[PDB]
Scaffold this motif. Structure first.
Motif, PDB file in Angstrom:
ATOM      1  N   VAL A  10       0.828  -1.201   0.000  1.00 14.95           N
ATOM      2  CA  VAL A  10       0.000   0.000   0.000  1.00 14.95           C
ATOM      3  C   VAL A  10       0.866   1.256   0.000  1.00 14.95           C
ATOM      4  CG1 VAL A  10      -1.719   1.311   1.258  1.00 14.95           C
ATOM      5  CG2 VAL A  10      -1.908  -1.180   1.146  1.00 14.95           C
ATOM      6  N   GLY A  11       1.824   1.328   0.922  1.00 14.31           N
ATOM      7  CA  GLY A  11       2.614   2.528   1.106  1.00 14.31           C
ATOM      8  C   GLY A  11       3.681   2.729   0.042  1.00 14.31           C
ATOM      9  N   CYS A  12       4.369   3.863   0.162  1.00 18.30           N
ATOM     10  CA  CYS A  12       5.448   4.249  -0.736  1.00 18.30           C
ATOM     11  C   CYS A  12       6.655   4.638   0.101  1.00 18.30           C
ATOM     12  CB  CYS A  12       5.038   5.424  -1.634  1.00 18.30           C
ATOM     13  SG  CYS A  12       6.408   6.055  -2.651  1.00 18.30           S
ATOM     14  N   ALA A  13       7.831   4.148  -0.285  1.00 17.51           N
ATOM     15  CA  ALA A  13       9.004   4.375   0.554  1.00 17.51           C
ATOM     16  C   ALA A  13       9.470   5.824   0.499  1.00 17.51           C
ATOM     17  CB  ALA A  13      10.134   3.431   0.144  1.00 17.51           C
ATOM     18  N   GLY A  14       9.174   6.532  -0.590  1.00 18.88           N
ATOM     19  CA  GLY A  14       9.477   7.954  -0.634  1.00 18.88           C
ATOM     20  C   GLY A  14       8.775   8.727   0.466  1.00 18.88           C
ATOM     21  N   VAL A  22      15.425   2.333  -8.869  1.00 16.11           N
ATOM     22  CA  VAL A  22      15.808   3.738  -8.781  1.00 16.11           C
ATOM     23  C   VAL A  22      14.580   4.591  -9.054  1.00 16.11           C
ATOM     24  CG1 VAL A  22      17.548   5.439  -9.465  1.00 16.11           C
ATOM     25  CG2 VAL A  22      18.051   3.019  -9.630  1.00 16.11           C
ATOM     26  N   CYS A  23      13.535   4.411  -8.249  1.00 18.68           N
ATOM     27  CA  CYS A  23      12.288   5.121  -8.479  1.00 18.68           C
ATOM     28  C   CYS A  23      12.327   6.499  -7.819  1.00 18.68           C
ATOM     29  CB  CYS A  23      11.118   4.316  -7.935  1.00 18.68           C
ATOM     30  SG  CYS A  23      11.322   3.958  -6.142  1.00 18.68           S
ATOM     31  N   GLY A  24      11.282   7.294  -8.051  1.00 13.65           N
ATOM     32  CA  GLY A  24      11.200   8.591  -7.395  1.00 13.65           C
ATOM     33  C   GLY A  24      11.207   8.489  -5.881  1.00 13.65           C
ATOM     34  N   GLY A  25      10.673   7.391  -5.344  1.00 12.47           N
ATOM     35  CA  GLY A  25      10.582   7.243  -3.900  1.00 12.47           C
ATOM     36  C   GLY A  25      11.941   7.110  -3.235  1.00 12.47           C
ATOM     37  N   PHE A  26      12.757   6.167  -3.699  1.00 14.50           N
ATOM     38  CA  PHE A  26      14.051   5.983  -3.054  1.00 14.50           C
ATOM     39  C   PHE A  26      15.065   7.056  -3.436  1.00 14.50           C
ATOM     40  CE2 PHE A  26      12.381   1.683  -2.266  1.00 14.50           C
ATOM     41  CZ  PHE A  26      12.697   1.582  -0.915  1.00 14.50           C
ATOM     42  N   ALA A  27      14.756   7.898  -4.418  1.00 10.49           N
ATOM     43  CA  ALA A  27      15.577   9.058  -4.734  1.00 10.49           C
ATOM     44  C   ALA A  27      15.230  10.289  -3.899  1.00 10.49           C
ATOM     45  CB  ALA A  27      15.446   9.401  -6.218  1.00 10.49           C
ATOM     46  N   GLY A  35      10.312   8.310 -11.679  1.00 14.82           N
ATOM     47  CA  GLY A  35       9.101   7.549 -11.877  1.00 14.82           C
ATOM     48  C   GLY A  35       8.826   6.550 -10.769  1.00 14.82           C
ATOM     49  N   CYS A  36       7.579   6.089 -10.741  1.00 16.63           N
ATOM     50  CA  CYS A  36       7.163   4.988  -9.889  1.00 16.63           C
ATOM     51  C   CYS A  36       7.236   3.698 -10.695  1.00 16.63           C
ATOM     52  CB  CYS A  36       5.743   5.190  -9.362  1.00 16.63           C
ATOM     53  SG  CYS A  36       5.185   3.772  -8.357  1.00 16.63           S
ATOM     54  N   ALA A  37       7.878   2.679 -10.131  1.00 18.30           N
ATOM     55  CA  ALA A  37       8.046   1.441 -10.880  1.00 18.30           C
ATOM     56  C   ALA A  37       6.715   0.745 -11.092  1.00 18.30           C
ATOM     57  CB  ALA A  37       9.026   0.513 -10.157  1.00 18.30           C
ATOM     58  N   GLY A  38       5.740   1.000 -10.221  1.00 15.90           N
ATOM     59  CA  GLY A  38       4.471   0.315 -10.348  1.00 15.90           C
ATOM     60  C   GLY A  38       3.676   0.787 -11.543  1.00 15.90           C
ATOM     61  N   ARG A  39       3.814   2.061 -11.903  1.00 12.41           N
ATOM     62  CA  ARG A  39       3.080   2.560 -13.054  1.00 12.41           C
ATOM     63  C   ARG A  39       3.656   1.982 -14.337  1.00 12.41           C
ATOM     64  NH1 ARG A  39       1.472   7.675 -11.245  1.00 12.41           N
ATOM     65  NH2 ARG A  39       0.596   7.608  -9.133  1.00 12.41           N
ATOM     66  N   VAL A  92       8.193  -3.872  -0.384  1.00 13.01           N
ATOM     67  CA  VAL A  92       6.827  -4.318  -0.628  1.00 13.01           C
ATOM     68  C   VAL A  92       5.921  -3.096  -0.645  1.00 13.01           C
ATOM     69  CG1 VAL A  92       5.068  -5.999   0.018  1.00 13.01           C
ATOM     70  CG2 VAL A  92       7.442  -6.429   0.576  1.00 13.01           C
ATOM     71  N   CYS A  93       6.178  -2.184  -1.576  1.00 14.63           N
ATOM     72  CA  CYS A  93       5.378  -0.974  -1.663  1.00 14.63           C
ATOM     73  C   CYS A  93       4.124  -1.223  -2.501  1.00 14.63           C
ATOM     74  CB  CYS A  93       6.208   0.146  -2.270  1.00 14.63           C
ATOM     75  SG  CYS A  93       6.870  -0.385  -3.892  1.00 14.63           S
ATOM     76  N   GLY A  94       3.275  -0.198  -2.610  1.00 10.92           N
ATOM     77  CA  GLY A  94       2.110  -0.310  -3.474  1.00 10.92           C
ATOM     78  C   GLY A  94       2.469  -0.583  -4.928  1.00 10.92           C
ATOM     79  N   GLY A  95       3.582  -0.014  -5.398  1.00 14.71           N
ATOM     80  CA  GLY A  95       3.923  -0.142  -6.804  1.00 14.71           C
ATOM     81  C   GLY A  95       4.213  -1.576  -7.201  1.00 14.71           C
ATOM     82  N   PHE A  96       5.091  -2.243  -6.450  1.00 14.49           N
ATOM     83  CA  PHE A  96       5.474  -3.600  -6.807  1.00 14.49           C
ATOM     84  C   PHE A  96       4.437  -4.630  -6.391  1.00 14.49           C
ATOM     85  CE2 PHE A  96       9.703  -1.703  -7.337  1.00 14.49           C
ATOM     86  CZ  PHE A  96      10.032  -2.267  -8.561  1.00 14.49           C
ATOM     87  N   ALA A  97       3.402  -4.213  -5.655  1.00 14.95           N
ATOM     88  CA  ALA A  97       2.253  -5.058  -5.370  1.00 14.95           C
ATOM     89  C   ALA A  97       1.240  -5.084  -6.506  1.00 14.95           C
ATOM     90  CB  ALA A  97       1.557  -4.581  -4.095  1.00 14.95           C
TER      91      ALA A  97
HETATM   92  S1  SF4 Z   1       7.765   5.317  -5.988  1.00 14.08           S
HETATM   93 FE1  SF4 Z   1       9.117   3.522  -5.609  1.00 14.08          FE
HETATM   94  S2  SF4 Z   1       8.770   3.011  -3.411  1.00 14.08           S
HETATM   95 FE2  SF4 Z   1       7.034   4.370  -4.027  1.00 14.08          FE
HETATM   96  S3  SF4 Z   1       5.423   2.939  -4.657  1.00 14.08           S
HETATM   97 FE3  SF4 Z   1       6.580   3.503  -6.559  1.00 14.08          FE
HETATM   98  S4  SF4 Z   1       8.134   1.841  -6.769  1.00 14.08           S
HETATM   99 FE4  SF4 Z   1       7.330   1.741  -4.616  1.00 14.08          FE
END
Ligand code: SF4
Lengths: 273, 273
Positions: A93-97, A129-134, B94-98, B129-134
């Motif tokens: 559900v959540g986002c690490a960013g 290397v997504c927006g979240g971990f950057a 970017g978000c990897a989930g999109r 285990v964020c929303g994106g990769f779920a």
């Molecule tokens: S930005 Fe990264 S950490 Fe946040 S949901 Fe997308 S892939 Fe997951």
């Protein structure tokens, strides 16, 4: 205060190196804050001695209304390194960013960023290397980035992608400080990582050798510097720390084009045609 | 048509296991679609023989005034396996989930989910285990999940977190098929993982041994089944394949409480106090 982040592919000892690097740096009379921003790594256990310190986000999510106390989420470890784990996203559900920015915001309010700090280190996941971990880079929380890599195909690919994201925030002052190689005992590994670092416009700031004393020190829940200050590997991390501390070659990395990256993999036998 | 995803901590050969498993399944008269959803894994290179097949996202950004040809993004490899790479996010932005959402949708639009497919596999990153990769789970696209783990604490921690996301979306139909152990050649590894799998309500689908034939095959751009059909390790992946194909035990996992998971580490000598 130096503002450093360590990035890299998971599974090649990035957290071990960060903890050993910070432990070594503490013996040089440095006050260090270490914030784990990697939800698959125990970024502080070799410095604190336990397992999986209570994270900022888990504390915030926990039952009750009472305000977080700094002593709950910031614990002192070897060398007086202040240790913090941000915590992972709400699974699925959540986002690490948002989680990382949430933790840092709450740390700032509680005064963890003390005026006598010489270093803050972020140990950040580098597998995506997504927006979240950057966000530590984008928001200028970390200005000086080191990438842990090994002589493996996707470890170098990951590093190259981290450099692409790092280059995007060059205007704000983010720089590549250098590549750190965690030896997987691959043939020509040091030559390869030196060539990779050179093409990025950077350098291999240290080569960290495989040494069974690291597994012995971790079995004893310690860094090598703590487990055996006079050991050889301890001298390695002390070299690495000295190189980081006095590093004056910070650059906007130039990521390799795909054909040059693939060519280098063929050149050093990482993949055979 | 089976809809399977492989998750796990990175750096323990999850994608090796994914590509070798699908190879072994293709020898059993199966039509398979393989979608890489892991930005640090070259999820198709051992079935295609090259490096970093052109991704759906790279194809979309480079798109012309015309549309997009399925053959650009979907390529047949060993065993007739159709191979696709989503492509990671724009580095640092970017978000990897999109990207994963968009690639699956594009595969749907271009008719890649053909009537004669027996399996589609998603090789999904499991380090966060964020929303994106779920999204492969949440979106209902992957209903049968296998988790790769090893006898390491954070590898099992990571699997436990994946299970928390999986359980959260049980009403959508996703289920845990089992744990696959990529043996790190540590003592009592299989016993620990069998206990872990039992505490989740699942089972250890197979114990995959460490074997230098694997590194030999991959450096030569191949799966073990392809590199040596009569190999011992090949027979191992074939057993794994038969176990997955005939697996009729799909459950909503019961993730372990933190203290119970740490206890299991102490019980099996993974952590020494
Ligand atoms: S930005 Fe990264 S950490 Fe946040 S949901 Fe997308 S892939 Fe997951």
């Amino acid at each position: 205060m130096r503002q450093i982040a360590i990035y890299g592919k998971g599974g090649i000892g990035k957290s071990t190196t960060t903890q050993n690097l910070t432990a070594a740096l503490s013996t040089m009379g440095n006050n260090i804050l270490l914030v784990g921003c990697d939800p698959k790594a125990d970024s502080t256990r070799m410095l604190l001695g336990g397992l999986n310190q209570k994270t900022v986000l888990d504390t915030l999510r926990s039952e009750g209304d009472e305000g977080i106390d700094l002593d709950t989420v910031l614990q002192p470890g070897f060398g007086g390194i202040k240790c913090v784990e941000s915590g992972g996203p709400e699974p699925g559900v959540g986002c690490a960013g948002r989680g990382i920015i949430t933790s840092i915001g709450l740390l700032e309010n509680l005064g963890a960023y003390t005026d006598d700090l010489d270093y803050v280190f972020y140990d950040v996941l580098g597998d995506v290397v997504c927006g979240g971990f950057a966000m530590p880079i984008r928001e200028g929380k970390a200005k000086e980035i080191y990438i842990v890599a090994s002589g493996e195909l996707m470890a170098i690919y990951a590093a190259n992608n981290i450099c692409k994201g790092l280059a995007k925030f060059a205007k704000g002052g983010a720089r590549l400080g250098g590549i750190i190689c965690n030896s997987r005992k691959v043939d020509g590994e040091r030559e390869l990582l030196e060539a990779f670092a050179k093409k990025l416009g950077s350098h291999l700031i240290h080569f960290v050798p495989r040494d069974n004393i690291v597994q012995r020190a971790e079995i004893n829940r310690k860094t090598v510097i703590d487990f055996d200050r006079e050991s050889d590997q301890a001298k390695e991390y002390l070299t690495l720390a000295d190189n980081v501390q006095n590093n004056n070659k910070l650059v906007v990395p130039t990521p390799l084009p795909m054909e040059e990256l693939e060519a280098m993999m063929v050149e050093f036998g990482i993949v055979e045609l």
